[PDB]
Each structure stands twice: as C-alpha cells, then as structure tokens.
Amino acid sequence: KPRQKRTATKAYNVTQAFGRRGPEQTQGNFGDQELIRQGTDYKHWPQIAQFAPSASAFFGMSRIGMEVTPSGTWLTYTGAIKLDDKDPNFKDQVILLNKHIDAYKTFP
Amino acid sequence: SKKPRQKRTATKAYNVTQAFGRRGPEQTQGNFGDQELIRQGTDYKHWPQIAQFAPSASAFFGMSRIGMEVTPSGTWLTYTGAIKLDDKDPNFKDQVILLNKHIDAYKTFP
Numbered sequence: 001k002p003r004q005k006r007t008a009t010k011a012y013n014v015t016q017a018f019g020r021r022g023p024e025q026t027q028g029n030f031g032d033q034e035l036i037r038q039g040t041d042y043k044h045w046p047q048i049a050q051f052a053p054s055a056s057a058f059f060g061m062s063r064i065g066m067e068v069t070p071s072g073t074w075l076t077y078t079g080a081i082k083l084d085d086k087d088p089n090f091k092d093q094v095i096l097l098n099k100h101i102d103a104y105k106t107f108p
Numbered sequence: 109s110k111k112p113r114q115k116r117t118a119t120k121a122y123n124v125t126q127a128f129g130r131r132g133p134e135q136t137q138g139n140f141g142d143q144e145l146i147r148q149g150t151d152y153k154h155w156p157q158i159a160q161f162a163p164s165a166s167a168f169f170g171m172s173r174i175g176m177e178v179t180p181s182g183t184w185l186t187y188t189g190a191i192k193l194d195d196k197d198p199n200f201k202d203q204v205i206l207l208n209k210h211i212d213a214y215k216t217f218p
C-alpha cells in the first residue's frame with residue numbers, strides 16, 4: 001500500500017510501515033515501544049484513533065501544500081486538533097497522547 | 109455537525125465551510141478546496157482522487173510529527189508531515205493538476 005494508507009499491526013509494525021521514530025522534520029515522532037511493536041493492535045489504540053482525522057477533515061482542516069524537490073513531489077500538511085476540555089476523560093487523553101509523543105528519546 | 113471536528117465528513121448536505129470553516133490564509137484555517145469541492149465535500153466527482161492522499165489513522169500517527177500545545181483557548185494535538193506522490197503512477201500528472209486546482213483556490217473566489 002502507499003505509505004499514507006498503511007495500517008500497522010503486530011505483523012507489520014510501526015517501524016516496518018512508517019520508519020523508525022526520530023526528531024527530524026517529516027520523520028514520525030509518535031509511539032512508545034509498546035505502540036511501535038503493536039500498531040493498531042495496541043490495546044488503547046481506539047483512544048488514540050479518536051483524534052485521527054477523517055479524509056474529509058484531513059483536507060478540510062489542514063494547511064495543504066505541494067513541494068517539488070529532488071526526491072519527488074510531496075503533499076505537505078499541518079494542522080491542530082482540539083481536545084475536548086469538557087470530556088470527563090480529558091486528563092486520561094492527555095496522559096495517553098503524551099506517553100507516545102517523543103517517547104523514542106528514552107530508548108535506543 | 110455533532111461530531112468532533114476531526115471526525116466530521118463534509119457532503120453536499122454538510123459542506124466544507126459548515127464542517128471546517130471558511131478557507132483562508134491563517135494558520136488555524138484550512139486552505140484546500142475550490143468552490144465545487146467546498147459545496148460537495150465527499151460527494152465531489154473527484155473526491156476519491158483526493159482522498160487517496162489522506163492518511164489512515166495508523167499512518168496519521170505513524171508518519172506525522174505530533175505535538176501537544178496548551179494555550180488559553182485549549183489543549184491542541186498538533187500535526188505536520190509530508191506525503192510523497194508516486195511519479196511512476198500513470199495518474200500522476202492528473203493528480204498534480206487536481207491538487208493544484210484546490211490548494212489556495214479560495215484566493216480567486218468572488
């Protein structure tokens with residue numbers, strides 16, 4: 001599948017599908033070791049995926065651009081998704097997301 | 109309209125402006141869509157050819173740079189990334205035309 005359509009699982013994990021996590025621009029930085037190994041099989045995946053955009057919202061919310069560079073033509077995207085401060089589960093949603101953001105710094 | 113913004117689906121009955129706000133230049137606004145796509149959402153005739161570039165939830169969290177920013181307004185999950193087009197796809201030149209028709213299209217609206 002094209003990269004953007006891949007679904008990571010235990011059989012095809014986040015590193016396999018999307019590369020090692022790291023700090024570089026355009027390199028993914030999200031996932032602790034458990035999520036990296038399990039992808040969508042991770043047992044708290046639904047609580048992560050509630051923040052992922054639909055295809056319509058991806059194109060509706062984001063700033064989209066196109067860059068032609070020596071490596072190819074790239075669709076660029078930026079945006080932000082607001083957590084619901086009134087959701088009783090808000091504090092747990094913050095904990096969960098923070099557990100994965102830049103987790104790779106703490107392990108080889 | 110009751111869905112969280114990120115889960116909304118624009119259609120001809122719930123257009124891109126209704127679901128995602130007016131197109132514009134500001135960092136917080138979306139910039140994508142000509143008048144036809146804005147009115148039709150996922151009912152647009154060439155929506156599949158655009159949606160082929162949108163990430164799965166796994167790819168969104170796998171490919172993007174994700175951040176958490178706390179501001180007066182709220183707590184925001186930020187995202188940025190880049191998706192490479194396949195220039196060996198026979199449809200590539202059509203894809204470029206299509207994307208170019210929608211990116212910052214709002215600048216030429218009446």
